[PDB]
Design a protein around this ligand. Structure first.
Ligand SMILES: *[C@H](N[C@@H](C)C(=O)O)c1c(COP(=O)(O)O)cnc(C)c1O
Ligand SMILES: *Cc1c(COP(=O)(O)O)cnc(C)c1O
Lengths: 400, 402
């Protein structure tokens, strides 16, 4: 951690904060200058492919790529070899399903939540359709709070359990450690979608009891696009079948066949996103300078003021009322305005928010709504921004 | 996207600071990146950073427009329609997606034909599919230079379900007769898959001319783009056949807890947030390449290969691949008798010349030729004859020092 003012010192590294009030962090974060500079350095000063080529540029790129893997492993409490780079969380979750497919038999059971983003639902639906599996959903309420008694009943006899850490639509923070303990007791593989928690709060594989965990660098970690992570706990190394194979994944190859190399390269086919890995390690180091605790504290300030100000204007908001279980995401609706209209009006005031179903249609259907307006934060967002937002909201509500 | 007046290679080198520091002859592994490509990407990250998918707000609109622009630029570069372009992470992802998405079409005993010179990414997926489903995987005959026997190709491709070939060999530098192989596959009713990872950005790559049904390339190679962006072309006639291997956010029209319906191409194939920055960077590399012109690129590279190979012959240093330089790309693999390729490469590195050594992810090529690996010097338009002369001078000192 370093000494700095929050949010001011972070804002100074993000020129866009001078132009807009960016409340669409759940979709993607804004990117600080030092992350762009780290990537630029690769492209202009040490550009090369990895895999320990003899030449000095490849040696440098290889060292920085390995450094970056180790940075990511330490960020989530994993070992170097348990970190695989992918393009995004969605790729990572697809690879889990694809790579474990062979272990299932007709009738086996998979359990998830009813609030999953499509990327943590479709792959399991496909697998369940292909193999004749049972796909069950833990009961929960309209705020996103899961029924843990029901979770114990459902996870019992489950082959695999997949859950999101944080809902991208509702902002609910699930009791992932509790669910992971339940899964471990029952002998179920435990897969965590951490796309909305990484970089916003602590994410640790050992604490969560994760067997597989996915996250996206472009979200909370303040990294670039095109870089995702898939954590594979070591005990699955020889069980997980790499879905993508080719250059970089082998030890030997003849016309007649092949032999794969060891993790993590075993799972990384072709030239990785070397620039993106370097940028994501820069973003994790930038997050570490600020500190996760300061980030979580700042975001709770924002959520508390926002949700109190919407209460004053009688604007309904979704998700947990208990703010200790509410991440930096506030979904809401203005009675008698479609959420795209609210979004458009806010855009006119240079406030960026998202509208619609948020790739979580089953949440919208469970709630009986077509979508929501969503304001989401990061540590560079300020209470002054929130006040400006609430002023615009007030005028909108007073206008009718 | 129009050619401009330029001095080659000087006016390219001015945009690549590393050319002032090293002689970079490892372009087959990855290209050096011009400043304008970096600038374009920096613009996204610092000036219009947002996710795509037409979010209501202005930054999402700007990002979505630039992402769609970049897909059009890639489509036009290869002669495809917008909707036939899917972004991936690299060529290797693209070729794996082809095999995973077409696996369902095969029946036990169907035949897949490829070359014996394929990079592992255009071999392993077909080996896995053939082992799993009980298919026949055959290899067209060819010589040690990489020249395929087209008579054998016709024989093998008759009755094949799918044909997969590389346009250019990354180890040998052979340019295969892809148009002819594609004509054969079209005339025999075989699906034609082209690995263009070593051709894109170095010569013309056009899906119509090649008779491609699927085509893969990497942005970080000849197109002078960033890492982490690849392309998969899927001809429209396969939209009702090809099963998306990766599904989830951005791929759907509707979802319930009981199931889902997918959207239309190309979003049907693109699960989760794309590499928006990398697609923008790749479109900038393609525009940079269009200003230079593929013809100028091919001409410059040929001059470099011609002098390199002639100079190696003067040193009695053996080199691989075709002797007919019209069929030899900007890649020269060689070996120094008595010296392991890694040790050659290290001597070159001492002299600030960057080459690659080893098997080049093409073990069957090495095993066919009876060698363990090679030293490989590979070029781009920014490489100069001056550099080749420096290299030849260092090779001369090495050989005299043995
Ligand atoms: C890339 N080959 C080089 C990395 C090398 O020979 O050193 C290549 C691929 C794989 O591209 P990725 O971007 O996925 O690594 C596939 N086929 C060919 C012909 C080449 O050159
Ligand atoms: C965004 C998100 C995903 C998908 O992330 P991508 O980077 O778009 O693949 C998955 N799950 C959750 C909870 C998300 O917020």
């Amino acid at each position: 951690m370093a000494s700095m003012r929050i949010p001011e010192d972070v804002r100074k590294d993000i020129p866009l904060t001078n132009e807009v009030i960016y409340f669409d962090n759940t979709a993607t974060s804004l990117t600080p200058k030092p992350v762009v500079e780290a990537m630029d350095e690769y492209y202009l000063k040490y550009r090369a492919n990895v895999h320990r080529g003899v030449h000095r540029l490849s040696q440098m790129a290889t060292h920085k790529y390995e450094e970056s893997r180790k940075i990511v492993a330490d960020f989530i409490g994993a070992k170097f070899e348990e970190i695989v780079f992918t393009k995004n969380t969605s790729e990572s979750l697809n690879l889990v399903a694809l790579g474990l497919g062979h272990i299932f038999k007709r009738g086996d059971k998979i359990v998830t939540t009813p609030y999953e983003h499509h990327s943590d639902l479709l792959p399991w639906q496909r697998l369940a359709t292909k193999l004749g599996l049972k796909l069950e959903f833990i009961e929960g309420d309209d705020e996103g709070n899961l029924d843990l008694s029901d979770a114990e009943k459902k996870i019992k006899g489950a082959k695999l359990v997949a859950v999101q850490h944080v809902s991208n639509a509702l902002g609910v923070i699930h009791e992932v450690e509790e669910l992971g303990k339940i899964a471990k007791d029952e002998g179920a593989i435990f897969v965590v979608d951490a796309a909305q928690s990484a970089g916003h709060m602590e994410v640790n594989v050992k604490k969560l009891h994760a067997d597989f965990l996915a996250f996206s660098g472009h979200k909370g970690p303040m990294g670039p696009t095109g870089i995702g992570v898939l954590y594979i706990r070591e005990e699955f190394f020889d069980t997980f079948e790499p879905p993508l194979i080719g250059g970089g994944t082998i030890e030997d190859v003849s016309l007649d066949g092949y032999k794969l190399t060891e993790p993590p390269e075993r799972f990384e086919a072709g030239t990785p996103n070397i620039g993106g890995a370097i940028g994501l390690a820069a973003g994790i180091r930038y997050i570490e300078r600020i500190g996760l605790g300061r980030i979580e504290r700042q975001e709770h300030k924002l959520v508390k003021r926002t949700t109190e100000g919407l209460d004053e204007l009688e604007v309904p908001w979704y998700g947990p009322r208990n703010l200790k279980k509410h991440a930096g995401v506030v979904s809401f609706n203005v009675p008698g305005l479609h959420p795209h209209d609210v979004a458009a009006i806010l855009d006119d005031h240079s406030i960026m928010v998202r509208s619609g179903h948020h790739c979580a249609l089953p949440v919208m259907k469970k709630l009986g709504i077509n979508g929501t307006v969503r304001a989401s934060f990061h540590v560079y967002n300020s209470l002054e921004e929130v006040e400006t937002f609430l002023g615009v909201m007030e005028e909108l509500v007073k206008g009718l």
